[PDB]
Design a protein around this ligand. Structure first.
Ligand SMILES: [Co+2]
Ligand SMILES: [Co+2]
Lengths: 12, 92, 92, 12
């Protein structure tokens, strides 16, 4: 994963 | 107008200066004081960040979502205010 | 691997050519066939769109969120696949 | 609202 990409996910 | 003055800020992931992180939390707090709906909260935050920190920002506000985004270095934050998640980042 | 082959695509808002809209739906379908989690679905779509349609795309996938974003003309789509919403746009 | 801004909201 590139340094300036981000992947987010909300909590349950 | 005061119902957000007891909400907890939890930073989940940030690539951002401490001061700008504080401003993001403050901005989101102001937005949520004024607006009930996620899209209006997101709009308030995006527009304020475009003014204070230059275009072009993007804001997602909600309780259930995943994302994959690209941002300019030092211009990314993902955090909760109470039970609501806020994604805010600069690209373009 | 086949559990998405009966899901309904509903375009909510698009500023995008019909062909690119079709590709977005197809890409999201492929993503959801492979991945269960919203963040991984979003990642698959973003990466494919960066390859097929140039950087820089951003993708949000979820059941509860609002957004305010800025995009390059003719490079925006917001749609559901079944009960899951997908926001996909180019900025930067 | 500018032409190239968009505002989205999920259904209930
Ligand atoms: Co209040
Ligand atoms: Co399947």
């Amino acid at each position: 994963q590139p340094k300036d990409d981000k992947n987010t996910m909300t909590d349950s | 107008g005061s119902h957000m003055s007891d909400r907890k800020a939890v930073i989940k992931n940030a690539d951002m200066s401490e001061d700008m992180q504080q401003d993001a939390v403050d901005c989101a707090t102001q937005a949520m004081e004024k607006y009930n709906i996620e899209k209006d909260i997101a709009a308030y935050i995006k527009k304020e960040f475009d003014k204070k920190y230059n275009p072009t920002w993007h804001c997602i506000v909600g309780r259930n979502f995943g994302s994959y985004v690209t941002h300019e270095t030092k211009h990314f934050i993902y955090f909760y205010l109470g039970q609501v998640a806020i994604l805010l980042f600069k690209s373009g």
